[PDB]
Amino acid sequence: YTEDSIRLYLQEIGRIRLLRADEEIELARQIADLLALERIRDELLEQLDRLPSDAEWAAAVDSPLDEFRRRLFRGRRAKDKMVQSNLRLVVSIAKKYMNRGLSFQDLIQEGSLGLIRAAEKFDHEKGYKFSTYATWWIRQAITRAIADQSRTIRLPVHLYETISRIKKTTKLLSQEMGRKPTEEEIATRMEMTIEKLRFIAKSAQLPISLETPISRLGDFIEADGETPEDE
């Protein structure tokens, strides 16, 4: 009866055995069948402007309602197992950003979405291991989540990319010239105005908390209003 939540999640994960490549291929085939069936249903939804009933959906596949429903179930369970047995991969990738703005548990749950998408777009016919395709999606989901959920004043992804390129250019100039580059040099190298560079530098800052010891910061800030004297 531990109180830790991450350890409990890791235990819940460890109760699942890793898949094998043949198991991956089988599950990928069932997942593809489920995806095609879902696409058909979506077509029925466009035709009916409503959710099709199981009987209408079974009729759309010329399949007995029992056979159709069992096929649907198998596909659901296949996708479920594919995601479930790879959560360990999700944790292995998510542990590499535990100090960037999102807590470890948030990284895990955001990488789970990438794993789900990877399991939805895996192609067995490609002839590759699922652990190679899934890594890209897990990493992308975690990086996007960090870009969109790490700051109180959220910055767009293009701003993160701009800041990264500014850092790389600054390091390259420092290595080339053997000294710290100036603002004008960096602005010329980046082909952008110095005011834009200063704006990027100002927007990259982290907001300081009101309760920073100085005694707290929040007790030294005046209030917006009209002074009784000025009325």
Binding site: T182, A201, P228
Partner: protein, 1042 residues
């Protein structure tokens, strides 16, 4: 025999530079990736250092950092191809320690305090139950890592409690370590006591031992022998997660009696077995075992900048190694070079955080050289790894008999910090393990051997010897006089024959600090007033013309040579050039030496750090002769106050309860006047509307208030600024030409002086401006302050006071020669405070004035006679009386008292009073504050607090209780609502007062509404209701927020 006073701060940085950084680089040098293909080696024995950029003075005036760059050679080795790309990588910027023991961080002088902590090792303790027997426990504490607690139960059981988890019998731990029964049976001395535990808990084998250890440490997981093994290896055996330290190994070997090498710094089987054996023997009372005292200075250590830096560097290096491994495995190609592999951001961040934002690196105390000197010799019990204010109790804040000669028993703060911050004694020093030592002379057959060299000794060493104090008197050569001699044996005071004395302290002032060593006639003062005087000596203010005491103590020339503000000639020659800013001395036969003097600089506490020359042009100068002096020194030695005529008698109520009555000569003779320099800052930022401009085109201002600006919007050097005067003119682009808005910087209310420096820093000039700023202007304003009503004056013996009246010199009492006094002090404050030493100094100072002499009396001077101080003072006064020729100077009927007359009427007082020359100091600190209406807080809409923002005075709940006891209801209600946070009643009250009408009734203050909103936000349906008047109606919920 006093060595360098600030040496605890140098030795620890010399050590860090010599062998402190190397050990931490080498401890992490071999970095390997997971595939085992690439390896980074850091040849940390060859780290070079780049010369500091800028300079010490340039860093100070630019508001930068004084530092160097560290470059270590590295070699990336490919495990297969074997290509080795040798290179030198940038590691970080290391701030450097100046010649005075301090660091310069962001253009401010900072000092790293010394921390007194508990030393690593094994400590035994015996606890007694309410009704049970004595049970013994042992704690094993490393320099860094997890603790290992052993405990003995009431039934004879041995338990181990790794970390703070539940206990586990020692058998599990000993079997998990890989020990068979025979070895743990042989090493233990009394094996049946442990055999009882073996029988009660069952003999675990290694496999099940590791299983149970894993089960107890990490419940909820399936046990695994390898899992347990790894857990133990990471807990107590991992060189990078458990460090005993050199001191930890030394203490373990000394206590347990082992012989393990000094190089091994992790726990070993021998260690735990020994510790258990010692616990068993202590339980059974073997004879050579003893519980430990944690307040003993032999079980406590001092950490200084070297150790704390090492630890921060270690953390940064761990982060750097993680980054390196991440940016090494990912690479699918060996296109990496050691320069592109290391990232100095974590190490730079760790060093910057340690030197700028830690609570062990402190803003320097720089009021005078004495405060500066005692700030570098300070020992703290608080910080990251020590105590906390709420956890420190009575036992920790007391004096321990092991502090004798190592920590001053007098100099401490008063208040919440009493006993938690201490000061190193005069002769004490810290050895290479971290324990405070103190020197002694050897005594052979009752003879003190001052020919041999002082033997230093730690607290534990001097427990079996009989040590005599430094006030024992010896005859010609060295033999100790007397028949009984006080000694210390095993932390107790006894008396012995002087043939059984082992060691003698070097000096009578070996027990006190440097600030307490500067109090003459100290043995005639109480300890509380000695504390007050020593503390207040470090709040004195450097004066316009300093002056040496007449009754100095002998340590003044030594307390000023370490602050690094006095210039002495190292050369026995002649002086060829003297100037207010430069001195030059030509060696008798040799090269010329040149010195530059600081002029009207500014300290951390806004005092002045001037430096003036003493010598004249074409002067013969010897080596070690004073050439220049600081702001608080006269000729070599400390000078914090002035010698003034004092009389002890009551005035017409102006001496009442520590108040001070002075003369007007102290104002027009420029006694007790000082220079204070303040710094004002203005920032040109970039708003979304536009940037901010510094210019003289200020709105709503006339040309009569732009006289002293330099046609750029900034005031001129040498201008006199009064209150509200513009210093830097700035305009902001407000959004609503007639668009600029005025937020120019002005002098605060109650401030005036001359402008002495206007430094400008802009990004164009190559300066490190803040992230969003485009111009930083700094203005320095200096002023001369005279003594005035409300200032604090002090003496060296603990007598403080506030000046309440300044009399014209024809109203002050005068002497039988016509000389009016300078200060009148109440004698009612002398006998109840037991600071009689002030009555001795005055009298000796009187003699010193009359004999044109200066007396150096050392504390505890009564080892030579029965009453040495009184006899010396009386003899000096009689000699002054005979030399001067005036019989009224000294009287035999009343030695220290002479006749004094009244300046108002000319009639003598009924009885003679005590007059003399007293050495008084002027203390720092700007406290007067008042407010009518100003800024308010964000959430509660209550007035802000603080002098710098027109803040209000807090009306706490004790004041509310006081007003409730008076029966006041309208004063209380006006204070609580109309004058604090009745957001609508404040304006109505102000408007009624201005117009002259009556103040209307208040409403509900805003803090109550904030609280109701917060309680609703906590999922509570709390509300305010108005009761129904008639019968068949429901109560109606009242809307406050309207």
């Amino acid at each position: 025999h006093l060595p360098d006073l600030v040496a605890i701060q140098r030795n620890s940085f010399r050590w860090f530079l010599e062998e402190g950084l190397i050990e931490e680089l080498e401890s992490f040098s071999p970095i390997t990736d997971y595939t085992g293909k690439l390896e980074l080696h850091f040849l940390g024995k060859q780290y070079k250092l780049k010369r500091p950029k800028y300079d010490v003075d340039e860093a100070k005036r630019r508001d930068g950092t004084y530092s160097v760059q560290m470059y270590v050679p590295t070699r990336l080795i490919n495990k297969e191809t074997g290509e080795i790309k040798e290179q030198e990588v940038f590691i970080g910027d290391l701030p450097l320690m100046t010649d005075r023991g301090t660091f310069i961080i962001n253009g401010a002088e900072r000092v790293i305090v010394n921390q007194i902590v508990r030393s690593p090792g094994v400590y035994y303790k015996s606890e007694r139950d309410k009704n049970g027997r004595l049970t013994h426990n042992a704690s094993l504490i490393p320099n860094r890592g997890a603790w290992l607690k052993f405990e003995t139960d009431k039934n004879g059981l041995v338990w181990v409690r790794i970390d703070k988890t539940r206990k586990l019998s020692a058998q599990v731990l000993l079997k998990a370590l890989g020990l068979s029964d025979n070895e743990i049976y042989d090493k233990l001395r009394h094996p049946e006591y442990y055999q009882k535990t073996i029988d009660k808990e069952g003999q675990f084998s290694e496999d099940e031992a590791l299983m149970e250890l894993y089960r107890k440490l990490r419940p909820g997981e399936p046990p695994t022998v390898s899992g347990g093994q790894q857990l133990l290896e990471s807990r107590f055996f991992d060189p990078k997660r458990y460090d005993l330290g050199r001191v930890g190994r030394y203490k373990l070997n000394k206590k347990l009696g082992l012989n393990v090498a000094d190089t091994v710094r992790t726990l070993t089987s021998e260690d735990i077995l020994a510790a258990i054996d010692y616990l068993i023997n202590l339980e059974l009372d073997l004879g050579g075992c003893e519980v430990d005292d944690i307040d003993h200075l032999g079980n406590r250590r001092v950490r200084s900048v070297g150790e704390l830096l090492q630890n921060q560097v270690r953390v940064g290096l761990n982060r750097l190694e993680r980054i390196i491994r991440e940016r090494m495995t990912v690479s699918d190609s060996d296109s990496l070079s050691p320069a592109s592999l290391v990232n100095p951001k974590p190490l730079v961040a760790a060093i910057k955080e340690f030197f700028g934002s830690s609570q062990l690196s402190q803003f320097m105390d720089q009021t005078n050289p004495l405060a500066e000197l005692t700030h570098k010799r300070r020992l703290s019990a608080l910080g990251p790894g020590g105590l906390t204010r709420e956890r420190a109790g009575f036992a920790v804040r007391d004096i321990h008999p092991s502090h004798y000669g190592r920590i001053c028993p007098i100099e401490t703060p008063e208040g919440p910090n009493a006993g938690l911050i201490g000061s190193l004694a005069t002769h004490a020093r810290v050895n290479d393990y971290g324990f405070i030592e103190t020197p002694f002379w050897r005594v052979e057959e009752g003879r003190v051997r001052k020919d041999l060299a002082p033997v230093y000794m730690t607290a534990d060493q001097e427990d079996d010897l009989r040590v005599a104090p430094g006030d024992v008197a010896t005859d010609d050569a060295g033999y100790i006089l007397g028949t009984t001699i006080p000694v210390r044996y095993r932390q107790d005071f006894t008396t012995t024959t002087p043939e059984r004395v082992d060691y003698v302290a070097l000096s009578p002032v070996q027990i006190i600090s440097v600030a307490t060593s500067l109090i003459p006639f100290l043995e005639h003062d109480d300890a509380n007033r000695a504390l007050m005087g020593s503390n207040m000596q470090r709040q004195a203010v450097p004066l316009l013309r300093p002056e040496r005491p007449l009754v100095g103590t002998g340590l003044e020339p030594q307390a000023a040579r370490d602050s690094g503000m006095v210039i002495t000639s190292p050369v026995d020659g002649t002086i060829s050039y003297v100037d207010a800013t430069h001195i030059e001395v030509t060696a008798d036969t040799g090269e010329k030496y040149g010195y530059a003097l600081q002029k009207y600089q500014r300290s951390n506490q806004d005092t002045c750090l001037n430096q003036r020359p003493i010598v004249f042009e074409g002067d013969r100068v010897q080596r070690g002769q004073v050439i220049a002096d600081g702001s608080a020194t006269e000729k070599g030695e400390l000078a914090l106050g002035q010698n003034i005529l004092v009389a002890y008698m009551p005035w017409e109520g102006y001496n009442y309860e520590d108040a001070i009555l002075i003369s007007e000569r102290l104002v027009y003779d420029d006694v007790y006047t000082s220079i204070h320099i303040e710094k004002f800052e203005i920032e040109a930022r970039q708003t979304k509307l536009g940037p901010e401009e510094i210019t003289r085109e200020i709105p709503n201002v006339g040309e009569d208030a732009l006289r002293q600006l330099d046609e750029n919007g900034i005031i001129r050097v040498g201008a006199w600024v009064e209150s509200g005067d513009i210093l830097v003119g700035k305009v902001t682009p407000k959004g609503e030409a007639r668009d600029v808005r005025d937020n120019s910087l002005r002098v605060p209310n109650g401030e005036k002086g001359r402008v002495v420096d206007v430094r400008l820093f802009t990004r164009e000039q190559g300066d490190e401006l803040p992230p969003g700023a485009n111009m930083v202007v700094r203005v320095y304003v200096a002023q001369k302050r005279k003594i005035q009503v409300g200032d604090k004056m002090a003496g060296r013996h603990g007598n403080k006071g506030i000046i309440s009246r300044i009399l014209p010199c024809e109203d002050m009492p005068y002497l039988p020669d016509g000389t009016p006094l300078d200060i009148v002090l109440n004698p009612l404050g002398v006998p109840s405070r037991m600071n009689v030493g002030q009555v001795f100094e005055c009298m000796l100072g009187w003699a010193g004035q009359l004999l044109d002499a200066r007396f150096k009396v050392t504390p505890f001077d009564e080892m030579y006679g029965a009453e040495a101080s009184r006899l010396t003072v009386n003899a000096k006064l009689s000699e002054a009386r005979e030399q001067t020729g005036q019989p009224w100077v000294f009287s035999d009927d009343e030695p220290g008292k002479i006749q004094v007359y009244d300046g108002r009427t000319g009639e003598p007082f009924d009885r003679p009073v005590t007059v003399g020359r007293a050495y008084m100091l002027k203390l720092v600190h700007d406290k007067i504050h008042a407010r009518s209406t100003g800024p308010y807080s964000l959430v509660t809409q209550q007035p802000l607090g603080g002098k710098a923002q027109q803040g209000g005075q807090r009306f706490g709940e004790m004041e509310v209780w006081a007003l409730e006891a008076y029966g006041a209801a309208y004063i209380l209600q006006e204070l609580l609502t109309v004058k604090s946070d009745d957001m609508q009643g404040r304006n109505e009250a102000l408007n009624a007062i201005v117009k002259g009408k009556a103040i209307p009734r208040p409403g509900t203050p805003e803090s109550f509404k904030v609280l109701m909103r917060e309680l609703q936000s906590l999922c509570l349906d709390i509300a305010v209701y108005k009761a129904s008047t008639e019968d068949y109606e429901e109560d109606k919920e009242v809307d406050l927020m309207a």
